[PDB]
Amino acid sequence: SVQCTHGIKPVVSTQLLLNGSLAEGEIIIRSENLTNNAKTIIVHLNKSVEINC
Amino acid sequence: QVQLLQSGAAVTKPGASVRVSCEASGYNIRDYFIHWWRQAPGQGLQWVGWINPKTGQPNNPRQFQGRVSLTRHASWDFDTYSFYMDLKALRSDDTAVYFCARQRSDYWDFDVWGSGTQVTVSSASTKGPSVFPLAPSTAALGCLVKDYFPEPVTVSWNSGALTSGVHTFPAVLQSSGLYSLSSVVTVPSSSLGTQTYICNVNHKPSNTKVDKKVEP
Amino acid sequence: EHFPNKTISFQPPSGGDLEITMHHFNCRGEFFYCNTTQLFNSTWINSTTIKEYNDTIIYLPCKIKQIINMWQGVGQCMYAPPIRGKINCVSNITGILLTRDGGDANATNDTETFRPGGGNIKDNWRSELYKYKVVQIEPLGIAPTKCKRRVVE
Amino acid sequence: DIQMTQSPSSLSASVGDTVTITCQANGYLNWYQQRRGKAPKLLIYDGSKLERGVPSRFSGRRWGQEYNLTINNLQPEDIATYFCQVYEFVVPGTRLDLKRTVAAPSVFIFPPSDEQLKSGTASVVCLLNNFYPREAKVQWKVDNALQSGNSQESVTEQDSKDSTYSLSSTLTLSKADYEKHKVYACEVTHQGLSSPVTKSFNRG
Ligand SMILES: *[C@@H]1O[C@H](CO)[C@@H](O[C@@H]2O[C@H](CO)[C@@H](O[C@@H]3O[C@H](CO[C@H]4O[C@H](CO[C@H]5O[C@H](CO)[C@@H](O)[C@H](O)[C@@H]5O)[C@@H](O)[C@H](O[C@H]5O[C@H](CO)[C@@H](O)[C@H](O)[C@@H]5O)[C@@H]4O)[C@@H](O)[C@H](O[C@H]4O[C@H](CO)[C@@H](O)[C@H](O)[C@@H]4O)[C@@H]3O)[C@H](O)[C@H]2NC(C)=O)[C@H](O)[C@H]1NC(C)=O
Ligand SMILES: *[C@@H]1O[C@H](CO)[C@@H](O[C@@H]2O[C@H](CO)[C@@H](O)[C@H](O)[C@H]2NC(C)=O)[C@H](O)[C@H]1NC(C)=O
Ligand SMILES: *[C@@H]1O[C@H](CO)[C@@H](O[C@@H]2O[C@H](CO)[C@@H](O)[C@H](O)[C@H]2NC(C)=O)[C@H](O)[C@H]1NC(C)=O
Ligand SMILES: *[C@@H]1O[C@H](CO)[C@@H](O[C@@H]2O[C@H](CO)[C@@H](O)[C@H](O)[C@H]2NC(C)=O)[C@H](O)[C@H]1NC(C)=O
Ligand SMILES: *[C@@H]1O[C@H](CO)[C@@H](O[C@@H]2O[C@H](CO)[C@@H](O)[C@H](O)[C@H]2NC(C)=O)[C@H](O)[C@H]1NC(C)=O
Ligand SMILES: *[C@@H]1O[C@H](CO)[C@@H](O)[C@H](O)[C@H]1NC(C)=O
Ligand SMILES: *[C@@H]1O[C@H](CO)[C@@H](O)[C@H](O)[C@H]1NC(C)=O
Ligand SMILES: *[C@@H]1O[C@H](CO)[C@@H](O)[C@H](O)[C@H]1NC(C)=O
Ligand SMILES: *[C@@H]1O[C@H](CO)[C@@H](O)[C@H](O)[C@H]1NC(C)=O
Structure with missing residues (x-):
């Protein structure tokens, strides 16, 4: 139970999540239904890959 | 109301390209995926792809990938959308009726279908019988x-x-x-x-x- | 694991707006659209052998836009002024947004292709608000007990 | 990994009858009705739920992995094709017609006209009229020699009153073999007919 959440950055991106919070256990693949290609798939990583622009 | 009006039939030559149209005007068009089905002569329907009206992102199977290209064009205020299919490299087994269906929910149930556009590709242009x-x-x-x-x-x-x-x-x-x-x-x-x-x-x-x- | 007997192959985006086909982000007011096609196509057939290579740096070209329509029809269109000087960002990649390509029935050659991009802006915030649920406290409970209120005479 | 099937797609019921069609899928399934060369109409979504503006006779059963579509007190306008749809996989569907209309086909033979051979084209046809069921084995014999690949076969729609079908089979042959002989027959065996019926014609 908490009173309110952690810091959430409103950063906006399209193909790669930026400035996020790493997964704890492992790579987690989340989708509303994995047998419905109209539903997007979110792959959330447990180790960052820095991109230098 | 919904009025998924489709364009008329098309006859061309092998190796050419045909753009099949489809028009939607009577609902909140931006919130429902528009799918494309094809029907071979005397055979069941076949999936071609869906296009997201908001972003235009298409999705096609392996065999259709590389040739087919789905596109949308909105009006000035998004009240009227037009959906086109550019089917490059028209080969022999493309003589089929094409439908622009409107997905309604997460069951992939299509309450509205287009009238249909019969597309045929071959030589021997119009002639007398x-x-x-x-x-x-x-x-x-x-x-x-x-x-x-x-x-x-x-x-x-x-x-x-x-x-x-x-x-x-x-x-x-x-x-x-x-x-x-x-x-x-x-x-x-x-x-x-x-x-x-x-x-x-x-x-x-x-x-x-x-x-x-x-x-x- | 979710697709047990197929090979996994990535492919670049197949079409759409410039905000879908190219990785879009922001630095100091300048709006970047990076290509990202060297990151997202490959094939993983059976992991038959480990292939060793040398260290390489992937260089993704990026375009820059000024007339920005961030949200397609609800957000106000904007013109981002140029920024004087050199722009440099160092950021982390903590997630990927994929979209499986639809399959067929006549012939599936044990392959599945995932193309990046897709989804709406909400999926950028579902990635953070997936742990949290809001509940309302009902602090009034009723249970039987052997006590009886002292009735006044 | 979606596996789905469909009924044998050949069943006949009379007017005012009840019919059930079964599918074996493992995903959100819908039931569509399609006419001949027309935009299919959704009937049932999510196994059993009924759609607005649909006759009440249609109903759905969600049991195990089997999905049942039931149509009660069939009307003459319900003779169409019906198919169960999963996300991106669609079976061809099922075929509908009226039963117990068994009859011996009427056989017609028409030799090619004289003016057709003046263009160097030969086409021999044997006509089948008022037959049921549609499935008929039409074989061509050129003096008891089977011809394969040069015949085109078509079947007309089910007519309104008689509810009988008519088949046209065109056999295409070279000029040499047609004009060298006299007798040619297109005999067809049908479940309706009791005996092999053959139509002939006398040149004169
Ligand atoms: C993505 O979307 C898809 C949909 O497209 C969705 O798929 C659903 O997946 C869930 C779980 O994976 C399925 O739910 C399971 O269904 C099992 C089978 O249900 C059938 O059988 C039930 C019992 O019948 C027995 O006898 C028959 C023969 O008569 C036999 O074949 C069966 O195997 C079984 O032995 C039957 O009750 C059930 O009927 C359902 O629907 C009716 C009407 O809606 C309802 O009244 C019933 O109560 C019941 O809900 C159906 O006929 C079922 O065995 C299984 O049950 C297990 O879990 C429960 C709860 O934990 C336990 O109590 C039970 O003992 C079992 O351990 C479970 O219910 C569902 O059917 C799928 N739906 C479709 C349409 O395919 C995916 O989940 C989606 N993905 C994500 C990530 O969300
Ligand atoms: C991030 O998650 C991955 C899982 O995908 C972890 O990879 C595993 O690491 C262990 C190390 O003991 C290996 O034994 C496993 O074989 C790895 N799994 C795979 C599928 O390769 C990785 O260790 C995690 N990293 C961090 C920092 O948490
Ligand atoms: C991000 O990029 C900048 C410049 O593109 C990097 O700064 C240079 O890094 C190279 C690496 O060999 C050095 O040779 C230069 O001397 C650095 N400075 C300049 C002005 O070019 C920066 O290091 C990069 N950051 C990360 C984390 O890779
Ligand atoms: C991102 O870059 C790739 C190349 O790295 C582009 O792919 C090329 O696109 C052109 C445009 O028609 C083709 O002619 C080429 O054959 C493609 N491949 C190569 C290797 O050049 C891609 O188009 C770029 N992204 C966008 C949105 O333009
Ligand atoms: C980008 O990722 C790196 C590594 O994942 C972050 O570096 C660490 O971040 C954690 C935050 O939980 C700090 O506690 C550590 O002190 C940081 N350094 C090391 C060496 O672990 C970095 O902070 C991330 N960048 C942003 C902007 O979040
Ligand atoms: C506006 O102009 C562009 C280019 O001239 C054109 O493509 C578009 O159809 C016009 N109308 C709208 C509503 O964008
Ligand atoms: C699928 O993969 C597993 C593990 O690689 C293997 O044991 C199995 O034979 C494959 N095929 C099927 C049909 O499970
Ligand atoms: C990745 O890029 C293209 C994208 O279609 C792909 O065909 C190719 O095999 C891969 N490698 C290179 C070097 O292009
Ligand atoms: C319903 O489906 C079952 C299969 O589960 C089948 O045996 C039965 O004939 C169908 N119809 C009825 C009315 O039960």
């Missing part, structure tokens, strides 16, 4: 139509007077690339030798009208 009578020997007798392009051709008897007992078979596409059919009507055996019967064929794309008497 050849009409063959059948020599008579209640019975049945009729005429035959051959080597016309493209569909359709209608056969009327006695210049729009006789239509009872007509059996106009669906047209068949032979190996040449042309179209043919045979239309027969039933008639009492006592009418032969006393009544004059004529078969009239109208071919609108070729603007050819042929009326032929049938006699023994």
Whole structure:
């Protein structure tokens, strides 16, 4: 139970999540239904890959 | 209300490209995926892809990938959308009816379908037909139509007077690339030798009208 | 694991707006659209052998836009002024947004292709608000007990 | 990994009858009705739920992995094709018609007209009229020699009153073999007919 959440950055991106919070256990693949290609798939990583622009 | 109006039929040559249209005007168009289905002659439907109206992102299977390209164009205020399919490299097995369906929910249930656009690709551009009578020997007798392009051709008897007992078979596409059919009507055996019967064929794309008497 | 007997192959985006086909982000007011096609196509057939290579740096070209329509029809269109000087960002990649390509029935050659991009902006915030649920406290409970209120005489 | 099937797609019921069609899928399934060359109409979504503006006779059963579509007190306008749809996989569907209309086909033979051979084209046809069921084995014999690949076959729609079908089979042959002989027959065996019926014609 908490009173309110952690810091959430409103950063906006399209193909790669930026400035996020790493997964704890492992790579987690989340989708509303994995047998419905109209539903997007979110792959959330447990180790960052820095991109230098 | 929803009015998923689709464009008319198209006839082209192998190796060409055809853009099949589709128009939606009567709902909140931006919140429902628009899918494309194709139907081979006398076969069940087949998936082609879906397009997201908001972002235009398409999704196609492996075999269609690389050739087909789905696109959308919104109006000034998104009240009217137009969806197009550019099917590059039209090959032999592309003669099919194309539907633009509207997905409604997460069950992939399509409450609204488009009227349909018959797309056919081949050589032998529009030309006149050849009409063959059948020599008579209640019975049945009729005429035959051959080597016309493209569909359709209608056969009327006695210049729009006789239509009872007509059996106009669906047209068949032979190996040449042309179209043919045979239309027969039933008639009492006592009418032969006393009544004059004529078969009239109208071919609108070729603007050819042929009326032929049938006699023994 | 979710697709047990197929090979996994990535492919670049197949079309759409410039905000879908290219990785879009922001630095100091300048709006970047990076290509990202060297990151997202490959094939993983059976992991038959480990392939060793040398260290490489992937260089993704990026375009820059000024007339920005961030949200397609609800957000106000904007013009981002140029920024004087050199722009440099160092950021982390903590997630990927994929979209499986639809399959067929006549022939599936044991392959599945995932193309990046896709989804709406909400999926950028579902990635953070997936742990949290809001509940309302009902602090009034009723249970039987052997006590009886002292009735006044 | 979606596996789905469909009924044998050949069943006949009379007017005012009850019919059930079964599918074996493992995903959100819908039931569509399609006419001949027309935009299919959704009937049932999510196995059993009924759609607005649909006759009440249609109903759905969600049991195990089997999905049942039931149509009660069939009307003459319900003779169409019906298919169950999963996300991106669609079976061809099922075929509908009226039963117990068994009859011997009427056989007609029409030799090619004289003016057809003046263009160097030969086409011999044997006509089948008023037959049921549609499935008929039409074989061509050129003096008891089977011809394969040169015949085109078509079947007309089910007519309104008689509910009988008519088949047209066109056999295409070279000019040499047609004009060298006299007798040619297109005999067809049908479940309706009791005996092999053959139509002939005398040149004169
Ligand atoms: C993505 O979307 C898809 C949909 O497209 C969705 O798929 C669903 O997946 C869930 C779980 O994976 C399925 O739910 C399971 O269904 C099992 C089978 O249900 C059938 O059988 C039930 C029992 O019948 C017995 O006898 C028959 C023969 O008569 C036999 O074949 C069966 O195997 C079984 O032995 C039957 O009750 C059930 O009927 C359902 O629907 C009716 C009407 O809606 C309802 O009244 C019933 O109560 C019931 O819900 C159906 O006929 C089922 O065995 C299984 O049950 C297990 O879990 C429960 C709860 O934990 C336990 O109590 C039970 O003992 C079992 O351990 C479970 O219910 C569901 O059917 C799928 N739906 C479709 C349409 O395919 C995916 O989940 C989606 N993905 C994500 C990530 O969300
Ligand atoms: C991030 O998650 C991955 C899982 O995908 C972890 O990879 C595993 O690491 C262990 C190390 O003991 C190996 O034994 C496993 O074989 C790895 N799994 C795979 C599928 O390769 C990785 O260790 C995690 N990293 C961190 C920092 O948490
Ligand atoms: C991000 O990029 C900048 C410049 O593109 C990097 O700064 C240079 O890094 C190179 C690496 O070999 C050095 O040779 C230069 O001397 C650095 N400075 C300049 C002005 O070019 C920076 O290091 C990069 N950051 C990360 C984390 O890779
Ligand atoms: C991102 O870059 C790739 C190349 O790295 C582009 O792919 C090329 O696109 C052109 C445009 O028609 C083709 O002619 C080329 O054959 C493609 N491949 C190569 C290797 O050049 C891609 O188009 C770029 N992204 C966008 C959105 O333009
Ligand atoms: C980008 O990722 C790196 C590594 O994942 C972050 O570096 C660490 O971040 C954690 C935050 O939980 C700090 O506690 C550590 O002190 C940081 N350094 C090391 C060496 O672990 C980095 O902070 C991330 N960048 C942003 C902007 O979040
Ligand atoms: C505006 O102009 C562009 C280019 O001239 C054109 O493509 C578009 O159709 C026009 N209308 C709208 C509503 O964007
Ligand atoms: C699928 O993969 C597993 C593990 O690689 C293997 O044991 C199995 O034979 C494969 N095929 C099927 C049909 O499970
Ligand atoms: C990745 O890029 C293209 C994208 O289609 C792909 O065909 C190719 O095999 C891969 N490698 C290179 C070097 O292009
Ligand atoms: C319903 O489906 C079952 C299969 O589960 C089948 O045996 C049955 O005939 C169908 N119809 C009815 C009315 O039960």
